[PDB]
């Protein structure tokens, strides 16, 4: 989380070494968070208000005690706003998708409630398709000024 | 006597070398203390100026 907040507070493009002139366009930030407890949330909002970024960011928060099925809709409505702000208003949205392992265990819960055959270790067979439909909604398009850059965070279980 | 004056001149040369080395080392000590008062006056001034600037940025953002 400290590495993601450090990247979020000091990522800048270099316009002089690239050769596209200079404007220093800063980053809008879309912060989706799925099961942040209270300590991670306190660190992120104190870091954002200390660097002065909550006037450029939009946060879709989902705490650890909130219900564990709205985690399915949290990243999709974060990236809906990210695609909107980048491709219809030409921002430079950076998307911090915290703790995707909570999203994957939420879809494991809803895919084991429906008796569906799993892939490996109980996760259902369509988890590749769900993670693809979340991740692949980023990048740059042609002739338009916008961009969606993605930094997810994963907690590898047995590292 | 001749070697009397030679030995007296050798003692004077030892005193002269001692005082010249004392002047050189005292100059080096006050020089390095001057650079440490210098460059410390650089570092804390730049740090406090940057703190003032970051406070102004946070105030206008708020």
Swiss-Prot record, chain A:
Highest taxon listed in the record's lineage: Bacteria
Coiled-coil intervals: none
Cited function: Produces ATP from ADP in the presence of a proton gradient across the membrane. The V-type beta chain is a regulatory subunit.
The family this protein is said to belong to: Belongs to the ATPase alpha/beta chains family.
Protein name (Swiss-Prot/TrEMBL): V-type ATP synthase beta chain
Species name: Thermus thermophilus (strain ATCC 27634 / DSM 579 / HB8)
Taxonomic path: Bacteria, Thermotogati, Deinococcota, Deinococci, Thermales
From Swiss-Prot, chain B:
GO terms under biological process: proton motive force-driven plasma membrane ATP synthesis
GO molecular function: ATP binding; proton-transporting ATP synthase activity, rotational mechanism; proton-transporting ATPase activity, rotational mechanism
Keyword set, alphabetical order: ATP synthesis, Hydrogen ion transport, Ion transport, Transport
Keyword presence, Plastid: no
Stated name of the protein: V-type ATP synthase subunit E
GO CC annotations on file: proton-transporting two-sector ATPase complex, catalytic domain
Function: Produces ATP from ADP in the presence of a proton gradient across the membrane.
Residues represented out of the complete protein: 2 to 63 of 188
Record field: transmembrane: none
Family statement: Belongs to the V-ATPase E subunit family.
Domain of life, source organism: Bacteria
């Amino acid at each position: 989380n400290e590495i993601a907040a450090q990247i979020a507070r000091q990522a800048t493009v270099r316009p002089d070494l690239s050769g596209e002139g200079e404007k220093e366009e800063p980053f809008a930030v879309v912060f989706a968070a799925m099961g942040i407890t209270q300590r991670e949330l306190s660190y992120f909002i104190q870091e954002f208000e200390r660097t002065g970024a909550l006037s450029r960011s939009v946060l879709f928060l989902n705490k650890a005690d909130d219900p564990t099925i709205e985690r399915i809709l949290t990243p999709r409505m974060a990236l809906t706003v990210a695609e909107y702000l980048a491709f219809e208003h030409d921002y430079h949205v950076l998307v911090i998708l915290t703790d995707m392992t909570n999203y994957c265990e939420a879809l494991r819960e809803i895919g084991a409630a429906r008796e569906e055959i799993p892939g490996r270790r109980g996760y259902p067979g369509y988890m590749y398709t769900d993670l693809a439909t979340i991740y692949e909604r980023a990048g740059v398009v042609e002739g338009k000024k916008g961009s969606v850059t993605q930094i997810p965070i994963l907690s590898m279980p047995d590292d | 006597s001749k070697l009397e004056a030679i030995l007296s001149q050798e003692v004077e040369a030892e005193i002269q070398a001692l005082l010249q080395e004392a002047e050189a080392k005292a100059e080096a000590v006050k020089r390095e203390a001057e650079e440490k008062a210098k460059a410390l006056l650089q570092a804390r001034e730049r740090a406090l100026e940057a703190q003032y600037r970051a406070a102004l940025r946070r105030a206008e953002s708020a």
